[PDB]
Design a protein around this ligand. Sequence first.
Ligand SMILES: [Mg+2]
Ligand SMILES: [Mg+2]
Ligand SMILES: [Mg+2]
Ligand SMILES: [Mg+2]
Ligand SMILES: [Mg+2]
Ligand SMILES: [Mg+2]
Ligand SMILES: [Mg+2]
Ligand SMILES: [Mg+2]
Ligand SMILES: [Mg+2]
Ligand SMILES: [Mg+2]
Ligand SMILES: [Mg+2]
Ligand SMILES: [Mg+2]
Ligand SMILES: [Mg+2]
Lengths: 137, 201, 76, 107
Amino acid sequence: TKFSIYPPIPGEESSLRWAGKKFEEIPIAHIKASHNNTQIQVVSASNEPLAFASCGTEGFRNAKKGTGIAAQTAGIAAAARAKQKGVIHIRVVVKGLGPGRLSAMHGLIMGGLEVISITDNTPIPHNGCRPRKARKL
Amino acid sequence: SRYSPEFKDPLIDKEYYRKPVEELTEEEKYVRELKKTQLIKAAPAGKTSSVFEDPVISKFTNMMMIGGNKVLARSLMIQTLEAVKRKQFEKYHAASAEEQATIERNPYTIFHQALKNCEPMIGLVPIQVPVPLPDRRRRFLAMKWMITECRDKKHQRTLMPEKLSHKLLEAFHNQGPVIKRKHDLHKMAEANRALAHYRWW
Amino acid sequence: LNNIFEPHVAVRDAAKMNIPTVGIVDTNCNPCLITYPVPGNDDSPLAVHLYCRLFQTAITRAKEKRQQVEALYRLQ
Amino acid sequence: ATPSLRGRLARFGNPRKPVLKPNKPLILANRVGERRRATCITEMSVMMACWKQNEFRDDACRKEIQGFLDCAARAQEARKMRSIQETLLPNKLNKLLQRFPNKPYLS
RNA sequence: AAACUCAGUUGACACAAAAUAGACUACGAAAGUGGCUUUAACAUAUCUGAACACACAAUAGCUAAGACCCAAACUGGGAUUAGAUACCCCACUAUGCUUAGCCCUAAACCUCAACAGUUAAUCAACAAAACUGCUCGCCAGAACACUACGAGCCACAGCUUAAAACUCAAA
RNA sequence: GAGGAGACAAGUCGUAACAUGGUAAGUGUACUGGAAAGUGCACUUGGACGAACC
Ligand SMILES: [Mg+2]
Ligand SMILES: [Mg+2]
Ligand SMILES: [Mg+2]
Ligand SMILES: [Mg+2]
Ligand SMILES: [Mg+2]
Ligand SMILES: [Mg+2]
Ligand SMILES: [Mg+2]
Ligand SMILES: [Mg+2]
Ligand SMILES: [Mg+2]
Ligand SMILES: [Mg+2]
Ligand SMILES: [Mg+2]
Ligand SMILES: [Mg+2]
Ligand SMILES: [Mg+2]
């Protein structure tokens, strides 16, 4: 069948299998791409922690954290840490629109891990919790 | 320039003219026909058809030149080449049969390989940002680094031929302050890696 | 109309200089200042040919009649 | 279809308060705006990582350095190709528009 | 830089606010009104009409009692500067919300009054083409002046109404 | 007694406004401050957002 971009229906007779594992079984890669910092945490199908990384942990300081290079470094570190845990295929669930949003995935790949799905989960309040006042520069 | 824009630079290459007509493509045939109707700048007094013409060495001599003393620059270049060859011959004779296979003795090859080893890959430009370097800039940076290192005051009373020959051999063997300078440029580029995004091209 | 669909400036100039103007005015033309407006199509080859033929015939008829009348009288 | 401008603006005979407040008249001009004006970064990072793990010694980095040079050459070639290919352009479009100017007045 | 040791996944979890629809132009007299359900409900005429009364009037603010996610005058600290009682960063309070009363101000502006009518022979400029009939309200150089005095007001550093002297040839 | 206004007039501290006036400007309202003023909440354009896609 021609490729379907939609994720497999939960609790359904889906044929897709990555190393024999179902999509709901594939581990998850939560990426928080804050404006100045990027963090990556790999968790299991049962949300059991597997690895963690971030610009600060990789060592970039202050403004240097909020850069694509630092995000890729954090992705590589997280991928390396997860590989020892045995993670191969991962579902990326990225929230935030920081500069590291895509470089995190690129580093997570260069570290060896394969990505099967991208799931944006940036918190978008329908409306609530009024944000801080605008900056005048 | 006293030459009108119509004048074209001369092509000094005997092979290009001795090439048979049959091997020529239609584009090449058209170019050759066109050149018969164009004006040609007088061949500069620097480059000739001698098989012993090395443009790299000629450019290095020009860079080493001071105040239009082309004769002295050429003398220094030939003295450096002779010193390099003599050192190579001495090492060759002093070395065993096995190492004689490894020991190079062609000063032109030594010079070219030394400059190639001294060519820097990535440069820094204000935007400071690491950036790619074009090939011409790479070659010029190599030559200028070599000449500046040879002109450094740290060497006392030592003549330019000896200094340059020693530095050239060190570079050919991937050692010396020139290679140290290239490594320093690479290290600074790595350190400013994070700023690579500032570049807009 | 000129080539931007505004009235031909020659219309205004002729009105200024007191030169009578005959003119084919289409539906989008401005006939106020044309001395003799002939409301009709002006974009079709057949219409343009008819206008040119009619005006040429009228001018030639007038000139030939003028010469004929001059000769007729001067013969007297 | 274009959004309706009926009753949007503040005008006489319009009971409703304005829906749009255009700081400039909503009348088409006779011109269009001019075409408004970091690659190889991944290759640079790869080469720099190889330098980091080999003490910036070319001996092992040869491959990454060659890839960096090839990527830079490709970027320059793409720049040249885009520049030549760029020359409907605003100049031609404005030339077309001038032949059919907007007429906000009466003939 | 200061600041917190707290940060990420998952689950439970509001008295705060109400993506997309909305490229819709609707409701209300105006202020205002854009999550869902229900109840009540959107004056009259085939006109205009209130400091001359009655009822409303965003935001801010006052009194009392609650709520407090987030935001936030003020305040403190960090940074900046020649100085920075600010712009930038962090914390937090009144306050923004609910209840019951006050306060009655906005560039409360669509700066374009209500009703009826016309597009005919135009129109200082700009703006949102030009007008006709009718009625009410308001204006008569600038500044003094959203001021002084008087008066009224749950207002007490207030609001509405509101001058004059001196000065100028301008505004 | 003291304040207010206007005028004459120079200095003084700043540069608040006039250009995106260098933090857009302003209205109401509140706190604060050598001083124009700063900020908070709402409102106006008497600012712009360059006006096809890019
Ligand atoms: Mg026509
Ligand atoms: Mg009435
Ligand atoms: Mg009234
Ligand atoms: Mg009120
Ligand atoms: Mg509070
Ligand atoms: Mg007032
Ligand atoms: Mg008063
Ligand atoms: Mg009083
Ligand atoms: Mg200023
Ligand atoms: Mg300003
Ligand atoms: Mg303001
Ligand atoms: Mg303050
Ligand atoms: Mg309003």
